[PDB]
């Protein structure tokens, strides 16, 4: 498929005194595997 | 490479402890003693290399095992305690008072006080690591904090005990350990702290200072503090519980100054005298004293101030008479409208016109019955223009002054509603700035009436969106809110892309400003609006909401709104909004002019023109050559939306300071841009910025100590910079009136002091900058570079005056404004 | 008019002692500094006819020193090894703006005029600018009372209120000497006057101006007073004056003949024929005696600020200011050392505090006291026969 578009994307917040503070008041406010292989007659077999 | 007495009590450690080591459990007290007693020797001494701790510290771990392994008993804590006290020197592990818990539960004095600042600070670090669980943990560790908080109390320590409650979260305790000798130091040191803490310790720390002031009886300071505090509830309560009449009298003066004024029953002493004092009905004639008694009672001409004679169409004309208003403002005299009259106000060519009468009225300005007078010689026109202008007048005349009747009530409500959206449009913001801080009702119930019907343009429905604003400022007003709601549902896309619509989330903001984290259900309210007008409306309201909070997260927030290319005006409300979570602590305001510095270089053009606006607020009658410069070298700049805002930010920040290194950037600037009139007309309104009042007005929106935010300054100053924020359209253009949201925040830059009757009494003072020598953690500022003058006098932006003499003792501790003064029985 | 330069400083965090408020102010910096820092970062991440004119421009571009222009596209220009060469102007050019002399940019190989370099400052003359600022405001200054005020009134209240002197038609002081023993605070009201002023400050050595070619010195005296006057207002703060200015005697010599004749450039960059901008001198000596009467003379330098030994009050000042940061022990009445009429300094001073508290140090006691204060005043100062008077 296309590699899809990459936006542009801010660098890690920075972290300030309190930050951690905010944060943690925000907180507180808060298979088969098949084993089988059918071909039909045209079959590419490596 | 030690001595000989060193070593001997080195090997007498080491056989102590060998001793402790040898499993004969019949002598381990006398050892436990002698070790104790060594130890609490060496730590109550001056010595800060206490030896017998330098000398365990190999035996640490071996004094552990010691410990874990002796039999439960009296030895098991009588050695904890010595575990404690050597691992007051190596920690990591934070074991003090994890061995302290497990002691002896002796007096916390004996070892010294550096065990005691150890101990506090490790209770903190384990107050702050501690869930909310664990509570049966957390109560022996109050203990060691009413230990701690008196220790510190007896040993000058009041910055120690106040930082060990204020981060336990619970600063309700200093209350029985203050004195009469402390709470000056206690609460100096807790108000310093207010301005840099988030909330909800802002309000805690403001509430014990608060607490700590009524507990000595000192009223005033206590009053400035519930002023921070937007609750009225609590300045009633102080207001209403004193005694003394005097002081009463300066507290009026206080909440007079500020925007509040408080229904008083008919039980207090002298009702009819408080409230005339908390009316401003004697601001007029205070005022005019003081001029005549500095010889400025003398109109000045706009050509005065252009001084064009050294070194006229429709628009500089207009200019003429906005710079003759903001010139003679308050004075009731002129020359140009007062006097010939008829002729400043007549060849303004139509819309202008709206403006040259409400020059009138800032010309009489506190001034009801002159105002009156005057203004209804021109209240009767037969072009519209003139009546509006004159209703507008009228409101500026009764703003800040709180008149028994209501003038401007009865004028301007019979034009409100009015059938032509001219009349309305300045009575309705007559009403606004007339009727400010009030937060009357009945004025309410008259305007949010007219934001919605078939007759009403979007000038007229901002305006009323501003007046509703203003009137309840910082009051959460369920009515305001849900009609500037209805408003902003009920249009479309289009009908809401007018720039006249930012004045909706305008009057939100004014009427929660500075309510902070009660925001969020108006901007959840508000997540269905258009996008380009829900981040507009969202930041604004943000912004309104965080004002003089200083949240450093929410200016992060806006930086992050700015650093979005947008290839977009939500960025410049960005930029506004830097600067007025930040015009609060000092060191904010350096930071974000570097920040504003930054945003003229790395920025788009959008908020280009926003950063001009934000110095202009962040700095507001506070000339800086650090701001002035930067604005000069912007005033020059090709984009004209840049240079107009940097033009009328060199006004605002220089504004009602007659700065003379500004007034010749003005006039140089107004022959630079002589040819393009759009310039010429800022900078004839940045000159008439600079003289307003002929050197007599502040336009900060912080008087008392430059700590108190007058809600209404805030008002005009956010309403005028809004609309700055489309000049070409709202100012440069129609909306020129908006101008006149400045009288919210004009208001006298004086020092005027009286005796126990409302009578003056000129004393001598010393004025000079907000200087200190060592701030110590709680001693007060004491003035450097002193001035001898007498009272009345003129205080400029970091000016405060000190009593030359002791003869007098004033009421409050801040000689800022009305000042009453009692006569000292001690002496002098 | 460039501009002031200023001097980038932080604000300053009023409690000196370590505390919490003194943390609060410190994180606020701290968070707004990361703003900042974060901002710049996120304009950088989120972000043709200039540069093909670039390329066209020469690649190793050339300067050299335009000499006498012609036409409206041809110029004569110096090639800075001797040989000048009649070459052309691009359109690129401003042009209404080359002046003869001025060290415009030419094309390596075809040496087109192309750029104009109106930055060529000598580095001699760009270092000895000031960019930080000083943290030694005037709260650091014990007493010296007049003399702030002096210095203010010069340069200080003519950029803070310039009005007082237009409303009487007064030239403010454009000049000032600041003399004295060694050691009294010459230096730090100049360090004071950097850190408080929104002005260029421009730190010079009587001893750098001095150069080791002939005519390089005046050279760079005309160099150094050339930017202070672009860049104004302006402080040139030149320390130890009388490196050169020292009297102006009939020399023998060369190197002493070149030496008076960087004086004389001085001279006349302080009040020549011409004029001058709204640059402010501050020069500082210890022997003034020493010095040429045209070069203090009250048109180049209108005031004169003596520096004595500071007196009682003064002292006990001094001892205050360089004592506040030190944890000083109520044993200490700094009230002894004061009273002895002995020629003690602010630097003395200073000496005595840092030299008690090593040896408060030494005896394994970080409390200063009385005995280490007597001790250390005794062991720093280093340095009328009995009974012929009296
Ligand atoms: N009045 C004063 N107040 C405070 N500190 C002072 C004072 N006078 C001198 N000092 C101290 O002197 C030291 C530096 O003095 P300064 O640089 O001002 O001397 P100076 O007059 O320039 O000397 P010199 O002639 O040797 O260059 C610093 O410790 C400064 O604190
Ligand atoms: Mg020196």
Redesign the pocket.
């Known amino acids: 498929e296309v590699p899809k578009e990459k936006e542009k994307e801010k660098v890690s917040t920075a972290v300030l005194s309190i930050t951690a503070k905010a944060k943690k008041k925000e907180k507180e406010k808060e298979e088969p595997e098949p084993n089988f292989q059918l071909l039909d007659n045209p079959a590419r077999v490596m | 490479e030690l001595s000989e007495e060193d070593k001997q009590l080195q090997d007498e450690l080491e056989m102590l402890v060998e001793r402790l080591g040898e499993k004969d459990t019949s002598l381990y007290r006398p050892a436990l003693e002698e070790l104790r007693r060594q130890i609490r020797s060496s730590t109550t001494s001056m010595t800060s290399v206490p030896k017998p701790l330098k000398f365990l510290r190999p035996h640490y771990g071996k004094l552990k095992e010691i410990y874990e392994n002796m039999a439960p008993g009296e030895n098991k804590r009588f050695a904890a305690d010595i575990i404690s006290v050597l691992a007051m020197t190596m920690s990591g592990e934070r074991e003090c008072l994890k061995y302290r818990l497990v002691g002896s539960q002796e007096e916390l004095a004996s070892w010294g006080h550096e065990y005691v600042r150890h101990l506090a600070g490790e209770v903190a670090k384990e107050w702050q690591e501690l869930d909310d669980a664990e509570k049966v943990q957390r109560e022996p560790l109050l203990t060691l904090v009413k230990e701690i908080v008196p220790y510190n109390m007896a040993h000058n320590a009041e910055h120690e005990a106040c930082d060990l409650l204020m981060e336990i979260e619970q600063v309700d305790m200093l209350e029985k350990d203050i004195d009469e000798n402390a709470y000056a130091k206690v609460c100096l040191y807790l108000t310093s702290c207010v301005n840099y803490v988030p909330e909800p310790e802002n309000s805690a720390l403001l509430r014990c200072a608060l607490g700590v002031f009524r507990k000595f009886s000192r009223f005033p300071e206590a009053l400035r503090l519930a002023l921070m505090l937007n609750d009225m509830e609590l300045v009633e309560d102080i207001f209403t519980s004193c005694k003394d009449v005097v002081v009463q009298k300066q507290m009026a003066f206080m909440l007079g100054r500020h925007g509040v004024f408080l229904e008083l029953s008919e039980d207090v002493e002298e009702y009819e005298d408080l409230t005339e004092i908390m009316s401003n009905v004697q601001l007029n004639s205070n005022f005019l004293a003081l001029a005549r008694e500095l010889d400025i009672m003398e109109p000045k001409v706009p050509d005065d101030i252009y001084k064009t004679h050294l070194e006229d169409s429709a628009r500089m004309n207009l200019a003429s008479s906005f710079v003759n208003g903001f010139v003679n403002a308050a004075f009731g005299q002129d020359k140009l409208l007062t006097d010939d009259g008829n002729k400043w106000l007549y060849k303004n060519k139509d819309h202008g016109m709206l403006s040259a009468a409400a020059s009138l009225g800032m010309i009489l300005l506190w001034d009801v019955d002159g105002g009156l007078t005057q203004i209804d010689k021109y209240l009767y026109s037969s072009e519209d223009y003139i009546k509006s202008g004159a209703l507008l007048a009228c409101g500026i005349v009764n703003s800040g002054v709180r008149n028994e009747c209501d003038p401007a009530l009865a004028l301007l409500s019979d034009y409100v509603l009015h059938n032509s959206n001219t009349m309305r449009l300045g009575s309705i913001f007559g009403l606004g700035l007339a009727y400010a801080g009030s937060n009357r009702e009945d004025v309410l119930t008259l305007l949010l009436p007219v934001m919605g019907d078939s007759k009403s343009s979007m000038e007229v429905a901002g305006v009323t969106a501003l007046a509703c604003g203003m009137i309840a400022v910082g009051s959460c007003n369920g009515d305001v809110t849900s009609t500037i709601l209805q408003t902003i549902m009920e249009k479309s896309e289009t009908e809401l892309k007018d720039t006249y619509a930012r004045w909706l989330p305008l009057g939100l903001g004014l009427n929660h400003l500075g309510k902070g984290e009660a925001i969020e259900a108006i901007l959840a309210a508000l997540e269905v609006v258009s996008e380009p007008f829900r981040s507009f409306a969202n930041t604004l309201v943000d912004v309104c909401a965080y004002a003089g909070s200083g949240n450093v997260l929410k200016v992060q927030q806006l930086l992050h709104i700015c650093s979005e290319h947008f290839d977009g005006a939500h960025q410049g409300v960005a930029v506004l909004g830097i600067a007025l979570i930040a015009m609060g602590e000092e060191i904010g305001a350096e930071m974000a002019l570097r920040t504003f510095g930054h945003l003229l270089r790395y920025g788009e053009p959008t908020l280009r023109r926003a950063v001009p606006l934000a110095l202009a607020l962040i700095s507001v009658s506070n000339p800086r050559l650090n701001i002035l410069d930067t604005l000069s070298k912007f005033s020059h700049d090709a984009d004209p939306e840049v240079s107009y805002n940097s033009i009328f930010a060199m006004g605002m920040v220089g504004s009602g300071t007659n700065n003379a290194r500004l007034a010749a950037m003005l006039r140089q600037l107004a022959q630079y841009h002589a040819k393009d009139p759009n310039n010429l007309f800022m900078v004839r309104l940045a000159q008439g910025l600079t003289h307003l009042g002929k050197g007599t007005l502040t336009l900060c929106p912080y008087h008392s100590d430059r700590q108190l935010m007058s809600q209404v300054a805030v008002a005009g100053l956010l309403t005028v910079l809004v609309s700055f924020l489309d000049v070409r359209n709202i100012i440069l253009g129609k909306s020129h009136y908006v101008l006149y949201g400045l009288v919210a925040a004009m208001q006298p830059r004086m020092l005027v002091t009286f005796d126990e009757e409302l009578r003056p009494l000129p004393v001598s003072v010393r004025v000079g900058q907000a200087v200190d020598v060592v701030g110590q953690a709680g001693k007060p500022k004491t003035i450097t570079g002193f001035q001898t003058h007498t009272t009345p006098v003129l205080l400029a932006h970091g000016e405060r005056a000190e009593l030359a003499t002791e003869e007098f003792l004033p009421v409050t501790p801040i000689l800022e404004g009305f000042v009453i003064l009692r006569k000292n029985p001690n002496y002098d | 008019t460039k501009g002031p330069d200023a001097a980038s400083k932080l604000p300053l965090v009023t409690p000196h002692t370590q505390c919490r408020l003194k943390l609060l102010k410190l994180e606020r910096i701290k968070d707004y500094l990361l703003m900042e820092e974060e901002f710049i970062r996120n304009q950088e991440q989120m972000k043709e006819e200039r540069s093909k004119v670039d390329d066209l421009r020469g690649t190793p571009m050339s300067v050299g020193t335009l000499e006498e222009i012609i036409d409206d596209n041809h110029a004569i220009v110096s090639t800075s090894v001797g040989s000048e060469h009649y070459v052309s102007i691009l359109s690129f050019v401003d042009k209404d703006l080359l002046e003869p002399g001025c060290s415009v940019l030419l094309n390596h190989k075809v040496h087109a005029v192309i750029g104009v370099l109106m930055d060529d400052t000598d580095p001699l003359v760009t270092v000895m600018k000031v960019e930080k600022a000083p943290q ?1 405001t005037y709260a ?5 009372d007049n003399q702030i005020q002096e210095i203010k009134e010069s340069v200080e209240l003519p950029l803070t209120h310039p009005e007082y002197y237009e409303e009487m038609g007064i030239k403010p002081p454009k000049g000032v000497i ?1 003399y ?10 100049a ?1 004071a006057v950097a850190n408080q002023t929104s002005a260029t400050f421009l730190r010079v050595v009587g001893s750098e101006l001095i150069q080791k070619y002939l005519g390089d010195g005046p050279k760079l005296v005309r160099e150094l007073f050339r930017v202070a006057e672009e860049h104004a207002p302006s402080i040139v703060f030149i ?2 004056i009388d490196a050169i200015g020292t009297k102006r005697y009939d020399s023998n010599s060369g190197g002493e003949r070149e030496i008076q004749r960087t004086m004389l450039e001085l001279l006349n960059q302080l009040d020549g024929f011409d004029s001058r901008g709204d640059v402010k001198v501050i020069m ?3 022997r003034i005696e020493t010095l040429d009467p045209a070069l203090i003379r009250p048109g180049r330098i209108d005031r004169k600020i003596e ?1 004595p030994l ?1 007196d009682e009050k ?1 002292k006990k ?2 001892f205050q ?2 004592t506040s940061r030190m944890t000083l022990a109520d044993d200490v009445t700094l009230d002894d050392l004061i009273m002895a009429k002995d020629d003690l ?3 003395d ?3 005595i505090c840092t030299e008690a508290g090593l040896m408060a140090l030494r005896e394994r006691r970080m409390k200063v006291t009385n005995e280490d204060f007597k001790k250390s005043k005794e062991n720093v100062l280093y340095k009328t026969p009995e009974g012929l008077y009296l």
Request: charged letters at 20%.
């Open positions: 030694e650091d200054i014990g007493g010296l600041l004295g023993p060694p050691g009294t605070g010459k230096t730090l009201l360090k320390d130890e500082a000596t210890n520096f500071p003064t000042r001094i200011i360089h300094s602010g630097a001073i200073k000496a």
